[PDB]
Design an enzyme around this catalytic site. Structure first.
Site, PDB file in Angstrom:
ATOM      1  N   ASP A 187      26.843  11.735  69.829  1.00  0.00           N
ATOM      2  CA  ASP A 187      27.641  12.971  69.921  1.00  0.00           C
ATOM      3  C   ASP A 187      27.894  13.426  71.368  1.00  0.00           C
ATOM      4  O   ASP A 187      27.380  14.416  71.825  1.00  0.00           O
ATOM      5  CB  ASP A 187      27.048  14.101  69.119  1.00  0.00           C
ATOM      6  CG  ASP A 187      28.030  15.238  68.923  1.00  0.00           C
ATOM      7  OD1 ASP A 187      29.128  15.161  69.520  1.00  0.00           O
ATOM      8  OD2 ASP A 187      27.713  16.229  68.177  1.00  0.00           O
TER       9      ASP A 187
ATOM     10  N   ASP B  20      25.792  18.458  75.156  1.00  0.00           N
ATOM     11  CA  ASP B  20      25.231  19.002  73.875  1.00  0.00           C
ATOM     12  C   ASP B  20      23.891  18.311  73.603  1.00  0.00           C
ATOM     13  O   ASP B  20      23.640  17.750  72.531  1.00  0.00           O
ATOM     14  CB  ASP B  20      26.207  18.753  72.740  1.00  0.00           C
ATOM     15  CG  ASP B  20      25.980  19.653  71.571  1.00  0.00           C
ATOM     16  OD1 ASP B  20      25.183  20.610  71.663  1.00  0.00           O
ATOM     17  OD2 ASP B  20      26.635  19.460  70.549  1.00  0.00           O
TER      18      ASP B  20
HETATM   19  N1  LIG Z   1      21.340   7.464  62.758  1.00  0.00           N
HETATM   20  C1  LIG Z   1      22.544   7.847  63.181  1.00  0.00           C
HETATM   21  N2  LIG Z   1      23.053   9.000  62.769  1.00  0.00           N
HETATM   22  C2  LIG Z   1      24.229   9.284  63.356  1.00  0.00           C
HETATM   23  C3  LIG Z   1      24.933   8.520  64.254  1.00  0.00           C
HETATM   24  N3  LIG Z   1      26.165   9.080  64.517  1.00  0.00           N
HETATM   25  C4  LIG Z   1      26.184  10.155  63.768  1.00  0.00           C
HETATM   26  N4  LIG Z   1      25.034  10.336  63.044  1.00  0.00           N
HETATM   27  C5  LIG Z   1      24.678  11.397  62.099  1.00  0.00           C
HETATM   28  O1  LIG Z   1      25.825  12.141  61.788  1.00  0.00           O
HETATM   29  C6  LIG Z   1      25.689  13.507  62.243  1.00  0.00           C
HETATM   30  C7  LIG Z   1      27.012  14.019  62.734  1.00  0.00           C
HETATM   31  O2  LIG Z   1      27.318  13.331  63.922  1.00  0.00           O
HETATM   32  P1  LIG Z   1      27.810  14.112  65.252  1.00  0.00           P
HETATM   33  O3  LIG Z   1      28.309  13.152  66.263  1.00  0.00           O
HETATM   34  O4  LIG Z   1      26.585  14.818  65.803  1.00  0.00           O
HETATM   35  O5  LIG Z   1      28.985  15.147  64.996  1.00  0.00           O
HETATM   36  P2  LIG Z   1      29.199  16.632  64.653  1.00  0.00           P
HETATM   37  O6  LIG Z   1      28.342  17.593  65.770  1.00  0.00           O
HETATM   38  O7  LIG Z   1      28.787  16.968  63.285  1.00  0.00           O
HETATM   39  N5  LIG Z   1      30.781  16.808  64.915  1.00  0.00           N
HETATM   40  P3  LIG Z   1      31.535  17.274  66.283  1.00  0.00           P
HETATM   41  O8  LIG Z   1      30.805  16.499  67.441  1.00  0.00           O
HETATM   42  O9  LIG Z   1      32.963  16.967  66.101  1.00  0.00           O
HETATM   43  O10 LIG Z   1      31.458  18.956  66.360  1.00  0.00           O
HETATM   44  C8  LIG Z   1      24.535  13.477  63.227  1.00  0.00           C
HETATM   45  O11 LIG Z   1      23.775  14.682  63.150  1.00  0.00           O
HETATM   46  C9  LIG Z   1      23.650  12.403  62.609  1.00  0.00           C
HETATM   47  O12 LIG Z   1      23.148  12.881  61.380  1.00  0.00           O
HETATM   48  C10 LIG Z   1      24.390   7.292  64.660  1.00  0.00           C
HETATM   49  O13 LIG Z   1      24.900   6.485  65.419  1.00  0.00           O
HETATM   50  N6  LIG Z   1      23.164   7.040  64.083  1.00  0.00           N
HETATM   51  N1  LIG Z   2      20.840  26.652  65.154  1.00  0.00           N
HETATM   52  C1  LIG Z   2      20.419  27.943  65.659  1.00  0.00           C
HETATM   53  C2  LIG Z   2      20.127  27.742  67.132  1.00  0.00           C
HETATM   54  O1  LIG Z   2      21.400  27.722  67.817  1.00  0.00           O
HETATM   55  C3  LIG Z   2      21.346  27.553  69.222  1.00  0.00           C
HETATM   56  O2  LIG Z   2      20.892  26.262  69.599  1.00  0.00           O
HETATM   57  C4  LIG Z   2      21.576  25.070  69.145  1.00  0.00           C
HETATM   58  C5  LIG Z   2      22.910  24.867  69.858  1.00  0.00           C
HETATM   59  O3  LIG Z   2      23.789  25.987  69.703  1.00  0.00           O
HETATM   60  C6  LIG Z   2      24.240  26.497  70.955  1.00  0.00           C
HETATM   61  O4  LIG Z   2      23.240  27.228  71.675  1.00  0.00           O
HETATM   62  C7  LIG Z   2      23.991  27.920  72.685  1.00  0.00           C
HETATM   63  C8  LIG Z   2      23.206  29.131  73.093  1.00  0.00           C
HETATM   64  O5  LIG Z   2      21.951  28.771  73.674  1.00  0.00           O
HETATM   65  C9  LIG Z   2      25.376  28.215  72.080  1.00  0.00           C
HETATM   66  O6  LIG Z   2      26.475  27.706  72.856  1.00  0.00           O
HETATM   67  C10 LIG Z   2      25.300  27.552  70.693  1.00  0.00           C
HETATM   68  O7  LIG Z   2      26.543  27.003  70.275  1.00  0.00           O
HETATM   69  C11 LIG Z   2      23.613  23.556  69.523  1.00  0.00           C
HETATM   70  O8  LIG Z   2      24.846  23.471  70.261  1.00  0.00           O
HETATM   71  C12 LIG Z   2      22.647  22.417  69.919  1.00  0.00           C
HETATM   72  N2  LIG Z   2      23.216  21.070  69.741  1.00  0.00           N
HETATM   73  C13 LIG Z   2      21.315  22.583  69.188  1.00  0.00           C
HETATM   74  C14 LIG Z   2      20.663  23.917  69.566  1.00  0.00           C
HETATM   75  N3  LIG Z   2      19.296  24.021  69.038  1.00  0.00           N
HETATM   76  C15 LIG Z   2      20.480  28.652  69.849  1.00  0.00           C
HETATM   77  N4  LIG Z   2      20.323  28.387  71.277  1.00  0.00           N
HETATM   78  C16 LIG Z   2      19.095  28.696  69.178  1.00  0.00           C
HETATM   79  O9  LIG Z   2      18.299  29.734  69.701  1.00  0.00           O
HETATM   80  C17 LIG Z   2      19.222  28.845  67.677  1.00  0.00           C
HETATM   81  O10 LIG Z   2      17.933  28.740  67.038  1.00  0.00           O
HETATM   82 MG   LIG Z   3      29.504  17.148  68.845  1.00  0.00          MG
HETATM   83 MG   LIG Z   4      26.479  16.667  66.589  1.00  0.00          MG
END
Ligand SMILES: Nc1nc2c(ncn2[C@@H]2O[C@H](COP(=O)(O)OP(=O)(O)NP(=O)(O)O)[C@@H](O)[C@H]2O)c(=O)[nH]1
Ligand SMILES: NC[C@H]1O[C@H](O[C@H]2[C@H](O[C@@H]3O[C@H](CO)[C@@H](O)[C@H]3O)[C@@H](O)[C@H](N)C[C@@H]2N)[C@H](N)[C@@H](O)[C@@H]1O
Ligand SMILES: [Mg+2]
Ligand SMILES: [Mg+2]
Ligand SMILES: [Cl-]
Length: 296
Positions: A210, A191
């Site tokens: 994440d 991701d």
């Molecule tokens: N600065 C900072 N922010 C963090 C950290 N861990 C989490 N965050 C913040 O918390 C948010 C949520 O964390 P994340 O792991 O991405 O989980 P999620 O995608 O919301 N949940 P899931 O992975 O279960 O679908 C991140 O976008 C970021 O804002 C860290 O170690 N440092």
């Molecule tokens: N938030 C809207 C955006 O969603 C998608 O991109 C996000 C994405 O979502 C996945 O994109 C895939 C399709 O390309 C799928 O598997 C999604 O789950 C997310 O999982 C990432 N961590 C961040 C990406 N920027 C789109 N790629 C992007 O074009 C769109 O603007």
């Molecule tokens: Mg996640």
């Molecule tokens: Mg996340």
């Protein structure tokens, strides 16, 4: 009191499950459709979910903290509670600023290059790990899609419009013809988008978060957001340069893999709706199919 209540509940659960943990402050820092993340005592992140719940992610942090050789920080789990109905992971907040397009555009050419080299280096090091000790965490995207297509066929496929059906079938035909699932498999973050990348005060990569979707999967997976052209991501050239620095990888196939994943998005959204009995997702995905079909 709206926001105030969620926080109270989670404060209660943290203190209850982690015996000598005292919550002096707690706020929401992020949320997904089925999870909430909190910042606690301005020091700890607590990721939480009411389940499909956090055991794999914890196993991956533990594997990576044991095996990665890098100065880039990642979560290190100090607290966990894992049950069927509830999961919680706690770790020290990695400090820094999340990479965004705006920030990137203020960086000098050299700063941008150094960030790209950092990313390439991290991916090379993670992709190169002997993954034997995490062999359980395999992900086959092609087979997952086939299974999700079967679930569609068993549920709502017959009620879809011809345009929706055509979009889905045209995707399945492409899936069947592609060779992009036949290359190197390795441990990927899976991701790997810039909202998970943290910068230090010199705009160098200092941490990555994440790893919740991580697994042994196609090497191409970790480049699909680095290649993405959108408001949220930096741009296709960014991913291309990173690919060139990373080396030994077919760029055109990485782009094909990204394009296929992108094409699947509205179907992914529909499937999520079915599995979680959330109609709004089913509707959103279908509407998105129309928008894509009518784009000139
Ligand atoms: N600065 C900072 N922010 C963090 C950290 N861990 C989490 N965050 C913040 O918390 C948010 C949520 O964390 P994340 O792991 O991405 O989980 P999620 O995608 O919301 N949940 P899931 O992975 O279960 O679908 C991140 O976008 C970021 O804002 C860290 O170690 N440092
Ligand atoms: N938030 C809207 C955006 O969603 C998608 O991109 C996000 C994405 O979502 C996945 O994109 C895939 C399709 O390309 C799928 O598997 C999604 O789950 C997310 O999982 C990432 N961590 C961040 C990406 N920027 C789109 N790629 C992007 O074009 C769109 O603007
Ligand atoms: Mg996640
Ligand atoms: Mg996340
Ligand atoms: Cl619908």
């Amino acid at each position: 009191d709206d926001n105030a209540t969620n926080v109270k509940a989670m404060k209660y659960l943290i203190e209850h499950y982690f015996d000598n943990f005292k919550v002096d402050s707690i706020e929401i820092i992020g949320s997904g459709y089925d999870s909430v993340a909190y910042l606690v005592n301005n020091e700890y992140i607590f990721k939480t979910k009411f389940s499909k719940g956090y055991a794999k992610e914890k196993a991956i942090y533990n594997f990576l903290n044991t095996n990665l050789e890098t100065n880039v920080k990642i979560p290190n789990i100090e607290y966990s509670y894992i049950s069927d109905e509830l999961s919680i992971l706690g770790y020290k907040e990695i400090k820094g600023t999340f990479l965004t397009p705006e920030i990137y555009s203020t960086m000098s050419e050299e700063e941008q290059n150094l960030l790209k080299r950092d990313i390439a280096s991290f991916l090379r090091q993670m992709h190169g790990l002997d993954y034997t000790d995490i062999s359980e965490c395999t992900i086959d995207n092609k087979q997952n899609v086939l299974e999700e297509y079967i679930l569609l066929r068993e549920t709502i496929y017959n009620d879809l419009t011809d345009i929706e059906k055509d979009y889905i079938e045209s995707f399945m035909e492409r899936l069947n013809a592609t060779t992009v699932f036949e290359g190197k498999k390795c441990l990927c973050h899976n991701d790997f988008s810039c909202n998970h990348l943290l910068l230090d005060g010199n705009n160098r990569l200092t941490g990555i978060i994440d790893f919740g979707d991580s697994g042994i999967i196609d090497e191409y997976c970790d480049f699909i957001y680095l290649l993405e052209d959108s408001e949220e991501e930096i741009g296709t050239n960014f991913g291309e340069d990173i690919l060139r620095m990373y080396g030994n990888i077919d760029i055109e196939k990485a782009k094909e893999y990204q394009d296929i994943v992108e094409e699947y998005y509205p179907i992914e959204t529909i499937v999520y709706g079915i599995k979680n009995i959330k109609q709004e997702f089913i509707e959103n995905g279908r509407k998105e199919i129309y928008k894509r079909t009518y784009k000139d």
